[PDB]
Each structure stands twice: as structure tokens, then as C-alpha cells.
DNA sequence: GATCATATTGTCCAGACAGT
DNA sequence: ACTGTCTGGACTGGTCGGCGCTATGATC
């Protein structure tokens, strides 16, 4: 039998991507949250007890209906994502929770009352687009190639970037070199509340415990005694039985022997938490602190407090062993200790917070109703009483707002971001984006750098630049994220397989400890046999693929870890037994024929998902011909370790790593036909390529991803040559005839919105052409494109500050104000479309989309796929451009100096492949590590009648003579970026100023100025230009004149009515002088005076 | 979204023979020979014809008015 | 009490004998008796009966410097 | 229905400070 | 007189573009 080929593995990977997709983590997480997360939150809250004697309301099952919207009139209609985007509506569905009132302990009839609206993930199980074909999505105005997985809040697409957090309820141990101590930390989670419990051992050998909302670290023995253990022996074997551990414990309780009872330790905790308080108040405060802060994941009842001490013991060992060399320090960046909070978990936390606030609001409402009406009206109809005491919007405005501003409860922020719609690549990259809670300004050398566990889970090259480097990553193409399964079933299976419970047998040095999701559950005699049995059962399909088993066999400690929780990024690997992979040719034939699916392959155990913990016990083979008897797994696709935008780069192994990173980052900034429904979309900014082209040198994954259907660039005939110094320093030279022929032509769409808002007292905006008699009239010619209804006509040429929607506002505190929506002063174009509809409040809403033709010119940014970027240096006419002996005139000219300095050989290989593909007609594969070899490409180029090196004899376009060097010319995929010079040119002479500092405004949209920062002032000082600095900072920004009293230095007051200048603090109607200074200095003086500081300006003569 | 009328390099008209080229490609023939018999000899025009993908049919379905 | 065993090869680089090493803690630590048994260093207690004071005096021997200057770590010659 | 007072109180470096 | 500990402050600049928020439970 043959040893298989990478083509079969590529077919298997294509089947995997077809079955699951690329936004599977969001969809699966949201489906899990919808199916049980709402029910779990409701059951956790349980019931609401208002201030009513002998009465309570309990919560039943909670369901979610179809996405529907209720208009201002009161009509409920089905809601579609396109309608939500156009009408600025939140794509949400009502939540119906049944309420069962309890009167005198007797349950009443359940009441089903809507509790709010929950936003619906696109293409989810609760969405209207689930199960629809391409034609059905087209009929609804949706792109069939749109992956979904995002939220529409107020008509704006919101994507929840995954969060790379630490593993909950898992203790991680490390040593602080500066503090000279061993520190172990656990982030215990309970109902969305995170508590950082810390156990440390300083140089003195004592153990300290850090508990949140506690200002000082207290001794470990004190908490151990206060947690339920009384005698010293209890603490002695609550940790371990190793003689070194026992002796360390003896030293600890000898040092901490001053406290022997639980009350004294609780008194110490309460005194540290709340000093200067009565003893019983400190006692109850310490009891509450211990119950609700000391490891909340173990519970809050005092009954489990003793068990918490056991969880303390397993911490102490982890502190002790690293302090004695028995065990090594675990990696904080290792993905076995790192979880990935997806949209489902964050949605569950947000819904829990919103539901708790809704519960407290309903409790207050029933309390107020009972206090006002009384017992007669309350109990005469308990169905209507509960329903009327509910405000659903109170919940809803907490959820969608957190999905609007991106701010999450608990201090987490930036969870939800605006979905990138620059092209097809950017949206997928954002939907597969992972952020970190670490600060961006912090230098994280151990965290930002690439880790060895990122293979197959995190893209090694596609990372942002600047402070976001390292902390923001993208999921790999083969990355798989686990879905939650009932842990009780897994624990029962483990117990029935032969794992002795922890409460039955004490841990022993000769026994293998068994951990379930970071929690020790018992010990087994043969850990290796148990691991092998679990793996065999998983391969046989008896248990779910979510369960991952790993075995750590050290000379000192032995452990077995079983993980079945969420947030674990896994990769698929082919199981290899006795040197033979489980995947055979029959499985590939079944996959190709369609009889076998990816889930079928997972079911038989041929291919299994491995996380970072299990892969520690695995020996993976990179290629099917490198498998040996000692190999345990076979890599499916080595090219799948890259991200979605990183696979766009052809031959990434032939390029430098920074070049590959730049190319992956700039793949999201390209312009092209990202979406087929771009014309009907109401995106505020968008770009379209007139003639987008699929690259001739493209990886095979791009066909499966969908980039071939939605290209974002064009193939450019690029000749590497120095041309008059206009391609110098990364610049490029473009052909004038090529630009005039439509090459790289783009259109930029900008959407403006106008709302007929209704104010208090019945005042509302009006859509009409403003009369010239009213104030704020921009000009007669500015409304020349308006119709009689105040709306601009479509296909009308517009310029800067041109009126699109004529709106009139009611006057403040006179004639009606002017609030017309106008084009930006630096922007122009043609009005593409006008949409009239209504908002959620029934007010009129007009959205005008204006398109501008963007012909390429000087300053327009063009980038290759290998990180080679630059602006256009010259628009050279075709007659002046050189041409080859074959009659080919390059469409682009790049400097030869940039190619070898940045070590970009992949660009040359792509040029050769593009020329070969154009000459032969067959597309050249550019996949990583399985692409067409360079030497083969040179061979076919030679067989095609061209030079092997790709060099061609070229003639000068001006002199007409033959060039003395053979110029390397080939087809390179060059993409135009959105950093066009049209939207980047800013020029301000004078205009609007800030109302506070009397300084020019910010940005370009409001005709703002340019900031002359501190560094510019410093270099102007270094230049010695005093008067230039005076003219820049003072005479052109905030020049003003003030009146100063010479007697006391206070700012004198000038009265125009009296016409006189005098100092109110002092008098001095004569000795007042005019001083020229910056308005910022006057504001600073006012701030100092407000801060009870008196600045006395001692005036001096100018001469 | 639609085939360009002329080649971006030399201005040679290619939109006339693009649909015949696409029809012959879907029949299973080698696109190189199809380009050869259609007079598309220079690889710049071959670049324009091969790298272009038709997408206007997916834009016409979304009415704008 | 600590029964200290040291490798001789490191003692071949410090350039001093074990017995003289004892002389560096006999005068300094008058509350303990230091004995040399070949290549093994054995200490003896005068009046010690609690584990608390053992951990308050064992680290003082380690922190004591036999020769050289305080705060000096690595040393190379070029 | 239309109004109205109130609306809670992450690291690292350097200087000052109890403790021995 | 030393020594570890508590407290306080700063964390390169600039630019393009967007998103979104800045009331409410009584009273007549
Ligand atoms: Zn005065
Ligand atoms: Zn041509």
C-alpha cells in the first residue's frame, strides 16, 4: 500500500472546512448559550422574593422566539438582518420566561411574560437565515458567502473577539526572582465573579494567603484553621504525607502557633479587613469574606468550607514542590493552562448581570405595588400582578448597550468591536480574532512572543503591528474549539472505569492522580492503562471527542489530566498505530465520493482533536512519508497552521517572517468585490474594485476559504527596474495607459444618515428645503440638488459641503434652525442611492449613499502579497515605459533595491509562477510546503521559450535603445489598499476652533488643524528659531489679549457697558495694562485660580 | 464584476472572446490551447482573461432602483 | 543540625582548605561548635532544643562569607 | 395623562517609614 | 546604622477612519 500523498490530506482538510466552516466557534458557542445558558442562569437565580408576606415567584423554563420587531404603531413583523442594518434596528428576538407565583406554599398557574429582547447571532440556530440555501439568502438581500457569526446592534455589525484568559479554577505556580518567593495563583469563577486566590512562600519559609478585598496577606495556617480544621494534625495531612512536606508544615504551624482556634483567626481576618470595628461585626464580616471570596468556585455554604481547605492543600503542595525542586514551574503562556472565552460565555455573563438587575427591578416593582394598592389588588389576580411589574427594556438596554460600546460588566472592555468590512479577508480575520486582557503598553516579552503550543491553534505570522503585536492573534485554519458537555457524565464514566475516588483512597507517591478539568477526583494504580483505555474508547466512539486525556509521568510526581470544558483550542491529527496511519485510501475515496463526512471520520477515531495538554504525550509526523513506529500522530496539513489572511501569501516559506506578517496584515486592507450585496448595504464606508482578479499564484486553501469567489486585487505585470528614481524608497511606478484602461480602478462609497428626531413637547425635525429667510443658510447653490421633499436626487454630482438631506430643527430657547446633512468638505462624488424608512421609534430615516470614482494617482498605496508596499511615484505614459522583446509592457515598475534587503524571494517565485500560469493557461499552486517547486517553474518557463531566471531583453521607452541588462519581469499579484491619497490629504488655513481652548479642532471631518506637538516645539527650540516658534504656537493657534492689574497681578475685568477696565479684587482703575498671550495660558490661570492658587503676573516693559 | 473590454497592458480587445473562452474551459479543454486558438498569444492578455472572474450575475440579483 | 558535605573540586577552585573554613565560623558563631570530619562539615549545638531557633541559625551560616568581598558573584579573567 | 427634585461615596523605580 | 515594606507616579509622538453614551421614581 502507498504511503499516501498530500493531495488526499488536502481533500480531507477541504471536507473538514466544508462541514464545519470558519466561524464555527461563534456559532457553536452561541448555540450552547441559547440551548442551556439562559436556562442555567435562570436556575442559578431561581426565584425572586419581594416584600410581600408569604408570597414568592419562582422561574420556570425560558425560551426564545423567532427574530421579530414591533413598530411604533404596534404591529409585530418578522425581522431580517438586511432590514435591521438598513433601518438601524437591533437584530434581536424576544425572550419568554414562564413565572410561577407561589401563594402560601401552593404553586399557581404559570405566567409567560416576555422579559426582554436578546440579540441574535447571524446564521445561528435562532436566526432566520439558518438552513437557507443560496437562493433564499439572495432573496433576503444577504450574501450567500457571508459566514455570519456576528451581531447587528442598532444597524451596525458587532463581532465578539475571543478572549485568551487563564484556565478557571486552575492553580498556576511561578517564582518571582525579584521577590525571591514561590507564588501560586488561581482565578476561581462563580456566577461571572472572578476571585484571585494566591498562596506564596517567602524567603523565611512561611506561607501567606492573598484573598481579594483584603488589604494584607495573612498566614496560610490562619486561614487553614479558620476554614474548619481545628487540630494541627488536620492541617498536617490536609496537604500531603511526604516527609519534606510534613516538615515544612511543622515549621509553618510552629511559626503560626499563636492562634489555635477558629475564632481567633476569624477575628484576625475581620480586623485586617475592617479595623476599628466591634468584635462581632468583624467576625461576621470575616465569615462573609471567607464564604464569598475564598475560592468561590467550591461553593459559598460553610458546609463545603472544609473542602476548600482541601483545595488549599493542593495549592500548598504546588507552592512547596517548586520551593523544593520536586516539580517544575508551569508555563503561563502554555495553551493547556489557557482558555478561550468565546461569545457564548461573555453573552452568558452579560445575560446573568442583566437578568439579576431585572430581577431586582421586578422585586422593587412588586414591593411598591403591594405597598400602594394593598393585599386586595395584589392577590385578586396574581397572573396580571406579576406581568405588570416587569420592565423588559431594563434588561434589553443593558444587553445591547454592552454589545454597542463593547464594554462588559466586571471591568472587561473591548469585547465587542465593529466588524471589519474592508474586504472578504478582513471580516473572516475579525471573526477569528483573539485578544488578551494584558495592557497594550506593557512590555510582555514572555507573552507577546510566539509559543510552541501555538502550532495548529494560533497563526504564527498574522499579527498586528505596534502595541497590539503579540497580544492580538488569529485562530489557525485547523484550530478547533471545544463545546461544553455535562461534566457529571464524564466524572461518572471515569469513576466506573476504575478510578478510585479521592475520599476513598488517600494520594500516594506510587499512585497516579486523576484530574478532571483541573480538579483532582482521585487516584488510580495504573495511570498509563487508564489513559490508553480512555483514548481507545474515544477512538471507538463510545465517549465524545471533547474529552482529552493526558499523562504526566515524572520521576517525582505522576498525574493524569482529563479536560472536557470550553475554551480549549484543538487541532485535528491522524492517529498512527504501529507506524501506519489510520487514514487509508478508502477513507479518502469515501470523502471524495461524499459518502463519508468529516464527523464520520472523527467518529471512527481515524482523526482526533488534540489540545495542548494531550499533545504533550504525542509525537507528530510532519509528512506521510516520515512516519515511523515511534510516531503517534500524523499532521493533516502543515500549511493549515497559518491563519486565513496568512494563507493568501504565495510561498510564505520563501519570505522573511516580518515580510509575511506585513503581507498578512495588508491582506485585510485591500479593495475588491468582498460582498455581492454591497450596493444595497448601508455601510458608512466601503470600497469596490471595478475589475477584481483572482491571483494566478494562489494557495489551494484560498479556493476553499472563498477568496477566489471574492477577490481583492489584480495581477500586475511588474518589471523590477530602476526608472528615473521615482520607484525609490519602496515607491512604485504605474503605467498611464494601464490606469486609463481600468486597471486598479476603485469606487469609494460613503453613507450619510438623517433622522427626523422628535423632541419634547411635540417638536420634531422636518424634511424640506430650508427657506433663505431662516438663519444658518449655507447658500443658494448648496440646495440645488434637493427635491421638494428635502431629499437629494440619485445620480447627482455633489461637492464638499453639499446638502444631501434638507432638515430643519426647532429653535433653542425665533426661526427654525438648520440641521441639514452635508457631504464632507474634502470629499465629493455622485449620489449612488437614497433610502427612506423608519427607525425603532417610528421617526423618518433617510440614508444617502454617495459614490466617488477613485482613479489611481500619486500617493495611492499599492502592496504585494509579500509585504512589499509603496505609493505611486509617477504616472508614466505607455510610450515612455520600456517593453520586452516579446512585446510586453509592464503594468508596474518596482525598485530592485527593495527585493534583497527585505529578503523577499517569494515575490520573485510568485512572478515566475504568474508568468508560467499566464503562458500555459493553468493556475500555479502557491500553497505552503506543498506548492509547485521553484525549479519546476523555471523548467516550464524554459520550455515555454523564455529565460529560466525570468529576465527579458527590454528596450528603453525614451531613447529606444536596448538595455544592457536583462530585466526581470513577471506577473505579481498587487492589491490596492484603502490608504488612498484622496481621503488622506488635509489642508487647513483658518476655520472652526474649539469652544474650550480656542484652538483648531480635531481630525479632518470638521476642518481641524494639524497638531504641533511637544517634539515639534523641542526641535524648533533646537533649531534656535524663536520667532518661528512664537508664530506657530502663539500667533497662529490661540493668540489673545487680556487686561492685567499692575498692583496685584490679578486679571482685570473690562466692562463694555461701562466702557472701563478695572481690577475687582484690588481697584486700580488706572494701572491696568494689556498683555498678549495664548488663550491656553489664560485657561491655565483660570484652572489654577479654581484650584485655590493665586498666580500674580508681574508685568514688565517690552523695552 | 464584468470582463474588461481591453487588456490592461496593450489595449487588445478581449471581452469578445472571453465568453467563448469560458465556455470552452467548462467543456474540459486545456485553457492554454483555447487562448492559443482565440489569438491570445501575449501573456498579459492571457493574464487578463485567465485571472478575471465573473461576478456581475451575483450583483444583478440585489435590486437598487 | 546541618551535616554539610561539599565537593572537593569546587574547593580546588576556592584555594583554601576545609579546616581553615572552620576557622571562619568558630569565632563568628560562638553559640555553635563546628567540627571537621574529613571532607564533611558537622556542626554541634551548645543549647538548642527548638526547631524555631534552628531555622533562625542555619541560614546565618550560609549567608556568612568565608573569603572575598560581600556582593561579589561571578569572576572571570581575560 | 404632564411635571420635578434628586441622582452612593500590571511593572518598575524612587522616596518615606517601622523594625532590629 | 541597615533592611524589608508601603506608598506614589509614569508607561514614544502624530495621523486616517468608525461606534457609541452622557435619567428617573413620585406627584395631582
Ligand atoms: Zn488689582
Ligand atoms: Zn495584452
Automatic annotation (TrEMBL), chain A:
It is an enzyme of class 2 (transferase). Residues 646-1006 form the DNA-directed RNA polymerase subunit 2 hybrid-binding domain. InterPro entries: DNA-dir_RNA_pol_su2, DNA-dir_RNAP_su2_dom, DNA-dir_RNAP_su2_hyb_sf, RNA_pol_bsu_CS, RNA_pol_bsu_protrusion, RNA_pol_Rpb2_2, RNA_pol_Rpb2_2_sf, RNA_pol_Rpb2_3. One of its GO terms (cellular component) is DNA-directed RNA polymerase complex. Zn(2+) 2 binds at residues 1048, 1063. The keyword Cytoplasm applies. Its EC number is 2.7.7.6. Signal peptide: none annotated. Zn(2+) 1 binds at residues 1045, 1048, 1063, 1066. Its cofactor is Zn(2+). Zn(2+) 3 binds at residues 1063, 1068. One of its GO terms (molecular function) is DNA binding. It is found in: Cytoplasm. GO terms for biological process: DNA-templated transcription. Keywords: Cytoplasm, DNA-binding, DNA-directed RNA polymerase, Metal-binding, Nucleotidyltransferase, Transcription, Transferase, Zinc. DNA-dependent RNA polymerase catalyzes the transcription of DNA into RNA using the four ribonucleoside triphosphates as substrates. Belongs to the RNA polymerase beta chain family. Part of the RNA polymerase complex. This is DNA-directed RNA polymerase subunit beta. It comes from Thermococcus kodakarensis (strain ATCC BAA-918 / JCM 12380 / KOD1) (Pyrococcus kodakaraensis (strain KOD1)).
Amino acid at each position: 500500500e502507498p504511503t499516501l500523498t498530500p493531495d488526499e490530506l488536502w481533500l480531507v482538510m477541504e471536507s473538514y472546512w466544508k462541514e464545519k466552516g470558519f466561524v464555527r466557534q461563534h456559532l457553536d458557542s452561541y448555540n450552547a448559550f441559547i440551548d442551556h445558558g439562559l436556562q442555567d442562569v435562570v436556575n442559578e437565580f431561581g426565584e425572586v422574593v419581594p416584600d410581600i408576606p408569604n408570597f414568592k415567584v419562582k422561574f420556570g423554563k425560558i425560551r426564545i422566539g423567532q427574530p421579530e420587531f414591533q413598530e411604533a404603531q404596534g404591529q409585530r413583523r418578522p425581522l431580517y438582518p438586511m432590514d435591521a442594518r438598513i433601518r438601524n434596528l437591533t437584530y434581536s428576538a424576544p425572550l419568554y420566561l414562564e413565572m410561577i407565583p407561589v401563594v402560601n406554599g401552593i404553586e399557581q398557574e404559570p405566567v409567560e411574560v416576555r422579559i426582554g429582547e436578546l440579540p441574535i447571532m447571524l446564521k445561528s440556530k435562532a436566526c432566520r437565515l439558518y438552513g437557507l440555501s443560496d437562493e433564499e439568502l439572495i432573496k433576503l438581500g444577504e450574501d450567500p458567502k457571508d459566514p455570519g457569526g456576528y451581531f447587528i446592534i442598532n444597524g451596525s455589525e458587532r463581532v465578539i473577539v475571543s478572549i485568551e484568559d487563564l484556565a478557571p479554577n486552575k492553580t498556576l505556580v511561578e517564582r518571582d526572582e525579584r521577590q525571591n518567593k514561590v507564588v501560586a495563583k488561581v482565578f476561581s469563577y462563580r456566577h461571572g465573579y472572578r476571585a484571585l486566590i494566591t498562596v506564596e512562600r517567602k524567603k523565611d519559609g512561611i506561607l501567606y494567603v492573598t484573598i481579594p478585598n483584603v488589604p494584607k496577606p495573612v498566614k496560610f495556617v490562619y486561614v487553614m484553621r479558620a476554614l474548619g480544621l481545628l487540630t494541627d494534625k488536620e492541617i498536617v495531612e490536609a496537604v500531603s504525607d511526604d516527609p519534606r512536606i510534613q516538615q515544612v508544615l511543622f515549621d509553618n504551624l510552629e511559626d503560626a502557633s499563636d492562634i489555635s482556634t477558629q475564632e481567633e483567626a476569624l477575628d484576625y481576618i475581620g480586623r485586617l479587613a475592617l479595623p476599628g470595628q466591634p468584635k462581632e461585626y468583624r467576625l461576621r464580616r470575616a465569615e462573609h469574606i471567607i464564604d464569598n471570596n475564598l475560592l468561590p468556585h467550591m461553593g459559598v455554604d460553610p458546609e463545603n468550607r472544609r473542602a476548600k481547605a482541601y483545595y488549599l492543600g493542593m495549592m500548598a503542595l504546588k507552592v512547596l514542590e517548586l520551593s523544593l525542586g520536586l516539580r517544575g514551574e508551569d508555563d503561563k503562556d502554555h495553551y493547556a493552562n489557557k482558555r478561550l472565552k468565546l461569545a457564548g460565555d461573555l453573552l452568558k455573563d452579560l445575560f446573568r448581570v442583566a437578568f439579576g438587575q431585572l430581577v431586582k427591578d421586578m422585586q422593587y416593582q412588586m414591593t411598591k405595588t403591594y405597598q400602594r394598592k394593598g393585599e386586595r389588588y395584589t392577590f385578586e389576580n396574581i397572573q396580571r400582578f406579576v406581568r405588570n411589574s416587569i420592565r423588559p427594556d431594563v434588561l434589553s438596554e443593558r444587553i445591547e448597550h454592552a454589545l454597542a460600546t463593547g464594554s462588559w460588566p466586571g471591568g472587561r472592555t473591548g469585547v465587542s468591536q465593529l466588524l471589519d468590512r474592508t474586504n472578504y479577508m478582513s471580516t473572516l480575520s475579525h471573526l477569528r480574532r483573539v485578544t488578551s486582557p494584558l495592557s497594550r503598553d506593557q512590555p510582555h516579552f514572555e507573552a507577546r512572543d510566539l509559543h510552541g503550543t501555538h502550532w495548529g491553534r494560533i497563526c504564527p505570522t498574522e499579527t498586528p503591528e505596534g502595541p497590539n503585536c503579540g497580544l492580538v492573534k488569529n485562530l489557525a485554519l485547523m484550530s478547533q474549539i471545544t463545546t461544553g458537555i455535562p461534566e457529571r457524565e464524564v466524572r461518572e464514566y471515569l469513576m466506573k472505569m476504575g478510578v478510585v475516588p479521592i475520599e476513598e483512597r488517600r494520594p500516594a507517591p506510587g499512585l497516579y492522580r486523576v484530574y478532571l478539568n483541573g480538579v483532582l477526583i482521585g487516584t488510580v494504580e495504573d495511570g498509563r492503562k487508564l489513559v490508553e483505555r480512555i483514548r481507545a474508547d474515544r477512538r471507538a466512539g463510545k465517549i465524545s471527542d471533547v474529552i482529552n486525556v493526558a499523562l504526566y509521568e515524572d520521576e517525582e510526581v505522576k498525574e493524569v489530566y482529563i479536560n472536557s470544558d470550553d475554551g480549549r483550542v484543538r487541532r485535528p491529527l491522524i492517529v498512527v498505530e504501529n507506524g501506519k496511519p489510520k487514514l487509508t485510501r478508502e477513507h479518502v475515496e469515501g470523502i471524495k465520493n461524499g459518502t463519508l463526512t468529516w464527523s464520520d471520520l472523527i467518529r471512527m477515531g481515524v482523526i482526533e482533536y488534540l489540545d495542548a495538554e494531550e499533545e504533550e504525550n504525542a509525537y507528530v509526523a510532519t509528512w506521510p512519508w516520515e512516519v515511523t513506529e515511534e510516531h503517534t500522530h500524523l499532521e493533516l496539513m502543515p500549511a493549515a497552521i497559518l491563519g486565513i489572511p496568512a494563507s493568501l501569501v504565495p510561498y510564505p516559506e520563501h519570505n522573511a517572517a516580518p515580510r509575511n506578517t506585513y503581507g498578512a496584515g495588508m491582506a485585510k486592507q485591500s479593495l475588491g468585490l468582498g460582498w455581492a450585496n454591497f450596493r444595497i448595504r448601508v455601510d458608512t464606508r466601503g470600497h469596490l474594485m471595478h475589475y477584481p482578479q483572482v491571483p494566478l499564484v494562489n494557495s489551494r486553501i484560498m479556493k476553499a476559504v472563498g477568496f477566489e469567489d471574492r477577490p481583492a486585487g489584480q495581477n500586475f505585470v511588474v518589471a523590477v527596474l530602476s526608472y528615473h528614481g521615482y520607484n525609490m524608497e519602496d515607491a512604485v511606478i504605474i503605467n498611464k495607459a494601464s490606469i486609463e484602461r481600468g486597471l486598479a480602478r476603485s469606487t469609494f462609497f460613503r453613507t450619510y444618515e438623517a433622522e427626523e428626531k422628535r423632541y419634547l413637547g411635540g417638536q420634531k425635525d422636518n424634511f424640506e428645503v430650508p427657506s433663505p429667510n431662516i438663519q444658518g443658510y449655507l447658500g443658494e447653490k448648496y440646495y440645488r440638488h434637493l427635491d421638494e421633499d428635502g431629499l437629494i436626487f440619485p445620480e447627482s454630482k455633489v461637492e464638499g459641503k453639499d446638502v444631501l438631506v434638507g432638515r430643519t430643527s426647532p429653535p433653542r430657547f425665533q426661526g427654525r434652525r438648520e440641521t441639514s446633512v452635508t457631504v464632507r468638505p474634502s470629499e465629493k462624488g455622485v449620489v449612488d442611492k437614497v433610502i427612506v424608512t423608519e427607525t425603532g421609534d417610528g421617526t423618518k430615516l433617510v440614508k444617502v449613499t454617495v459614490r466617488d470614482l477613485r482613479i489611481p494617482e500619486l500617493g495611492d498605496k499599492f502592496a504585494s502579497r509579500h509585504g512589499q508596499k509603496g505609493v505611486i511615484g509617477l504616472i508614466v505614459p505607455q510610450e515612455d515605459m520600456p517593453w520586452t522583446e516579446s512585446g510586453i509592457v509592464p503594468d508596474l515598475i518596482v525598485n530592485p533595491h527593495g527585493i534583497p534587503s527585505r529578503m523577499t524571494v517569494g515575490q520573485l517565485i510568485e512572478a515566475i509562477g504568474g508568468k508560467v500560469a499566464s503562458l500555459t493557461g493553468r493556475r500555479v499552486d502557491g500553497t505552503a510546503f506543498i506548492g509547485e517547486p521553484e525549479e519546476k517553474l523555471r523548467k516550464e518557463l524554459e520550455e515555454l521559450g523564455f529565460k529560466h531566471s525570468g529576465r527579458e531583453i527590454m528596450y528603453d521607452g525614451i531613447t529606444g535603445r536596448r538595455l544592457e541588462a536583462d530585466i526581470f519581469i513577471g506577473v505579481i499579484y498587487y492589491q490596492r489598499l484603502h490608504h488612498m491619497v484622496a481621503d488622506k490629504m488635509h489642508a487647513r488655513s483658518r476655520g472652526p476652533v474649539q469652544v474650550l481652548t480656542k484652538q483648531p479642532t480635531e481630525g479632518r471631518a470638521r476642518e481641524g488643524g494639524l497638531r504641533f506637538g511637544e517634539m515639534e516645539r523641542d526641535v524648533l527650540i533646537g533649531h534656535g528659531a524663536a520667532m518661528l516658534l512664537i508664530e506657530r504656537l502663539l500667533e497662529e493657534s490661540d493668540k489673545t489679549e487680556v487686561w492685567v492689574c499692575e498692583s496685584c497681578g490679578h486679571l482685570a475685568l473690562e466692562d463694555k457697558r461701562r466702557g472701563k477696565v478695572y481690577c475687582p479684587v484690588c481697584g486700580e482703575d488706572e494701572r491696568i495694562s494689556k498683555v498678549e498671550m495664548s488663550y491656553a495660558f489664560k485657561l491655565l490661570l483660570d484652572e489654577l485660580k479654581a484650584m485655590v492658587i493665586r498666580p500674580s503676573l508681574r508685568l514688565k516693559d517690552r523695552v | 464584476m464584468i470582463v474588461p473590454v481591453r487588456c490592461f497592458t496593450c489595449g487588445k480587445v478581449l471581452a469578445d472572446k472571453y465568453y467563448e473562452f469560458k465556455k470552452r474551459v467548462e467543456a474540459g479543454e486545456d485553457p492554454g490551447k483555447v487562448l492559443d486558438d482565440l489569438g491570445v498569444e501575449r501573456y498579459c492578455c492571457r493574464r487578463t482573461l485567465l485571472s478575471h472572474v465573473e461576478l456581475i450575475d451575483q450583483v444583478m440579483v440585489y435590486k437598487v432602483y | 543540625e546541618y551535616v554539610v558535605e561539599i565537593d572537593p573540586e569546587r574547593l580546588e577552585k576556592a584555594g583554601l582548605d576545609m579546616e581553615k573554613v572552620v576557622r571562619k565560623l568558630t569565632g563568628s558563631f560562638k553559640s555553635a561548635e563546628f567540627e571537621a570530619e574529613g571532607y564533611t562539615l558537622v556542626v554541634r549545638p551548645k543549647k538548642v532544643t527548638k526547631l524555631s531557633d534552628l531555622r533562625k541559625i542555619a541560614e546565618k551560616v550560609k549567608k556568612h562569607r568565608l573569603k572575598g568581598l560581600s556582593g561579589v558573584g561571578k569572576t572571570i579573567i581575560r
